[PDB]
């Protein structure tokens, strides 16, 4: 019963969710904040 509290939340989040559409499709522009952590700069061919 301990895991059902988060299982119900995760099932409610994807209930009716359409993954084909970006968020704010009809009202705004989806802004994506990105950064890069280079773990190792490999050899240059």
């Amino acid at each position: 019963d301990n895991t059902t509290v988060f299982t119900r939340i995760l099932d409610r989040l994807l209930d009716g969710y359409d993954n084909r559409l970006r968020p704010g499709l009809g009202e705004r522009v989806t802004e994506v904040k990105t950064d890069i952590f280079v773990t190792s700069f490999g050899p240059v061919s």
């Binding site: 359409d18 993954n19 084909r20 559409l21 499709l25 009809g26």
Partner: protein, 102 residues
């Protein structure tokens, strides 16, 4: 739900991606385009050259017709596997692959 969700769920119900548009009516006219990015090295010992392109195809499908205020449904690659795409292959390609990252 919403506007684009019900439009896509109404387009894709009763849809067979196995059958091309106008299967028993007329040939499907496909307008192709291409945008070369960087023709790579021309290998002479192995007799091939590498090319990187943006291969684009355009056709008509009467089953993918919707009447709403939305003009264009700009979709990602997730909707490719649900609709019909012509089996365009390159007749002189020794090896080729699309790009799958990210």
């Amino acid at each position: 739900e919403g506007d684009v969700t019900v439009i896509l769920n109404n387009l894709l119900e009763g849809y067979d991606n196995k059958l091309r548009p106008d299967i028993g009516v007329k040939p499907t006219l496909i307008h192709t385009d291409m945008y070369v990015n960087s023709i790579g090295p021309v290998n002479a010992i192995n007799m091939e050259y590498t090319i990187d392109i943006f291969f684009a195809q355009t056709w008509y499908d009467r089953r993918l017709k919707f009447n709403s205020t939305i003009k264009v449904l700009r979709l990602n690659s997730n909707m490719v596997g649900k609709i019909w795409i012509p089996d365009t292959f390159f007749r002189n390609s020794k090896k080729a692959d699309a790009h799958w990252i990210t």
